[PDB]
């Protein structure tokens, strides 16, 4: 069948942080398994994000490599859903060559707090039944829905739009009346005769409709910085946004909140692999988490007591004690056998592959011997070997094949020791 851009990646099988409305994790749901401690902790965090009333708050998701700390944060993003800003960035993603490392965090926070507004708009929407223009200009236009018909004498600044956009009888058109931009939607099915074809609009032609629109606080920073700032939003052309411009935009957005004219929508910055921000970057987070427009900061890390970057100092998670005091640490847990098998089952539903219960058994043993992510990769490879064999289902010997072809790290390093002097630099 046809392929999306969004194909089957590592986390893609998670379609939410699976929980009961008691914030209780059932054993496996919404694509994800186990972690009965960390999923409940992420449940409480998901309600703090979703409620938004507290600002400048953080959680550190930590544990052995391959224990879902990136996964539950992907599940958290899916459960939070659209229309509440979530930004995932890697810890190494802030090290710009044009923009300060500190300013890149100042900016990465502001992508993740929205300003939401609702604008009443007058929109015309109908099939154009007939359209005539004379030789200044005057013209007359007729519009139809499935329910009514209308005629309009046009003004000059519509004539210079309907003529400019080559509108013809039998088109379906939507017009923002305040501006005269013609959104042509297609042609009516009866005038498709002699290439999008569509039903005529319903209800009355002129609708007042509420448009609700969400602009990230950074997207207000950028629009204000150049002759046409918004291009630099896409192109990345702008960095070191002047700090007094943000100072004024905070004071402005604060008075819109206090007039009730706009609603700020707090969200998530997910600084994935935060273990390698510099001590300078942590020193920025130490204070930037202490302002009313700060988002909820979720951080992921797989490090023990380690030297924090740009220093000789060692501290837990590779984060200074200074910043670990701001935040709540959720430990993930290393998986048991039943959980490991059940994860491998849901991956096989996402890969869309069958395999025998003994194949899942040896794959679970491999997954316990070689830290899970390796066993997940063997699912893909073994199904491709069966497809080469014209086999319907992955039998144990097709895993034993793939397990010999593709080494895990531990065997690779062992087979590297017996060639230790042939490789360079060790």
């Amino acid at each position: 069948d046809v392929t999306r851009i969004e194909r089957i990646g590592a986390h893609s099988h998670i379609r939410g942080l699976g929980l009961d409305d008691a914030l209780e994790p059932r054993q496996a749901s919404q694509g994800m398994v186990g972690q009965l401690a960390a999923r409940r902790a992420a449940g409480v965090v998901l309600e703090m994000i979703r409620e938004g009333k507290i600002a400048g708050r953080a959680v550190l998701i930590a544990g052995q490599p391959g224990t879902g700390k990136t996964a539950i944060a992907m599940g958290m993003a899916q459960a939070l859903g659209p229309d509440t800003p979530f930004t995932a960035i890697a810890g190494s993603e802030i090290f710009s060559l044009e923009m300060s490392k500190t300013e890149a965090l100042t900016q990465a926070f502001r992508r993740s707090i929205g300003v939401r507004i609702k604008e009443e708009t007058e929109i015309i929407e109908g099939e154009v039944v007939e359209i005539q223009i004379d030789r200044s200009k005057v013209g007359k236009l007729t519009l139809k829905t499935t329910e009514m018909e209308t005629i309009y004498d046009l003004g000059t600044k519509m004539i210079e739009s309907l003529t400019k956009d080559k509108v013809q009888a039998g088109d379906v058109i939507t017009i923002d009346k305040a501006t005269g931009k013609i959104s042509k939607l297609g042609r009516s099915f009866t005038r498709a005769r002699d290439t999008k074809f569509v039903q005529c609009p319903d209800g009355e032609l002129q609708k007042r409709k509420e448009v609700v629109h969400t602009v990230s606080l950074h997207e207000i920073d950028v629009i204000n910085s150049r002759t046409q700032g918004f291009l630099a939003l896409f192109s990345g052309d702008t960095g070191e946004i002047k700090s007094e411009v943000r100072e004024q935009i905070n004071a402005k957005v604060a008075e819109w909140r206090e007039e009730g004219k706009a609603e700020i929508i707090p969200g998530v910055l997910f600084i994935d692999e935060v273990h390698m921000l510099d001590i300078e970057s942590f020193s920025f987070l130490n204070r930037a988490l202490e302002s009313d427009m700060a988002p909820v900061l979720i951080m992921a890390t797989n490090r023990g007591i380690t030297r924090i970057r740009g220093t000789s100092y060692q501290s837990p998670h590779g984060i200074p004690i200074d910043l670990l005091d701001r935040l709540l640490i959720v430990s993930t847990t290393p998986y048991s056998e039943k959980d490991t098998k059940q994860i491998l089952r849901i991956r096989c539903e996402e890969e869309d592959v069958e395999m025998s219960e003994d194949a899942y058994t040896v794959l679970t043993r491999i997954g316990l011997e070689t830290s899970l992510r390796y066993a997940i990769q063997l699912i893909t490879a073994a199904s491709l070997v069966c497809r080469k064999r014209k086999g319907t289902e992955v039998q144990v010997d097709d895993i034993k094949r793939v397990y010999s072809l593709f080494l895990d790290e531990s065997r690779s390093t062992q087979y590297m020791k017996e060639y230790q002097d042939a490789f360079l630099f060790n």
């Binding site: 604008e119 708009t121 448009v211 629109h213 629009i223 896409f234 935009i249 402005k252 706009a262």
Partner: protein, 314 residues
């Protein structure tokens, strides 16, 4: 190879089977970036803060008033004044103010007027030599503009046809560097060699093209005044600014219209000063030489026809 006339057609010339179509970049236009009526009306700091922005313009030493008050109404005989250099560059206090507060248009027009003035300064600077600027003392206006005194400055270079030839990389030509050139006569088959002379690059080196070209991403807005601001921008923001880029200065646009009728006009200065070697569009019409280079037989026929033409055979 993956019934017979298909082979014969391809072996004669592949355009009997598939013509080379005119290739062009994939053309893309993303939906225009939507700014709400609200952020347009209330959200722009250039607008909501305009009353405060006036004070940034008023409390400024670049006001002509403050320049005069510093430049000519000092207390001490010796006293430390900024803007002192505006007496030795040819700048009015209102020209300094305009150049600081009207933005890049005032920069560009003042630059074009300075290019004109550089030749006028160079003549006086290179032939005037009596006594001094007054009674053997005082400076004079323009006497901080020393960038004309270099042997290789554009006025002195233009005045000196030997030095002109050492500065060969004109910005609107494809100069490769120097080479020999060999000239062959049609009589006698004699040829002779011209030593180091300038060369353009061959006109066919320029063949690259973006696989994709995008319409410049544009902002839509729900507001009658926002429409006027973006319409005026898309028309080209003003007749001055558009002519300044397109024709090089608005004076050169006013001249271009009637240089149409002159015998010896001087070059246009804007984007119309350039002619890029394929035009501005990246669309490749397939060249007529592709008829030769796609068939080994048509190539063989051409070496035959040129051989036969040199021999005179019908």
């Amino acid at each position: 190879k993956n019934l017979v006339m298909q082979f014969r057609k391809v072996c004669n010339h592949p355009e009997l089977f598939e013509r080379q179509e005119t290739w062009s970049p994939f053309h893309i236009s993303l939906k225009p970036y939507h700014i709400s009526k609200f952020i347009y009306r209330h959200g722009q700091i250039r607008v909501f803060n305009h009353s405060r922005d006036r004070w940034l313009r008023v409390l400024s030493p670049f006001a002509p008033d403050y320049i005069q008050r510093s430049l000519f109404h000092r207390k001490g005989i010796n006293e430390e004044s900024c803007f002192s250099f505006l007496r030795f560059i040819d700048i009015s206090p209102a020209e300094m103010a305009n150049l600081m507060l009207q933005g890049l248009l005032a920069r560009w027009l003042a630059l074009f007027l300075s290019l004109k003035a550089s030749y006028r300064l160079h003549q006086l600077r290179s032939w005037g030599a009596p006594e001094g600027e007054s009674h053997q003392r005082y400076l004079r206006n323009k006497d901080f503009l020393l960038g004309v005194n270099f042997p290789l400055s554009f006025p002195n270079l233009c005045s000196c046809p030997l030095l002109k030839s050492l500065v060969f990389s004109s910005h609107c030509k494809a100069v490769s560097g120097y080479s020999d050139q060999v000239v062959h006569q049609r009589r006698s088959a004699t040829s002779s060699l011209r030593r180091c002379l300038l060369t353009e690059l061959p006109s066919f080196l320029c063949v690259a093209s973006p696989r994709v070209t995008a319409v410049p991403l544009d902002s839509y807005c729900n507001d009658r005044s926002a429409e006027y601001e973006r319409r005026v921008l898309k028309e080209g923001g003003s007749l001055a600014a558009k002519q300044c880029l397109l024709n090089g200065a608005p004076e050169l646009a006013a001249d271009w219209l009637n240089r149409r009728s002159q015998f010896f006009p001087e070059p246009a200065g804007g984007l119309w000063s350039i002619r890029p070697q394929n035009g501005w569009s990246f669309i490749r019409i397939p060249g007529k030489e592709s008829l030769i280079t796609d068939s080994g037989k048509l190539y063989a026929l051409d070496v035959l026809l040129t051989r036969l033409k040199s021999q005179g055979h019908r």
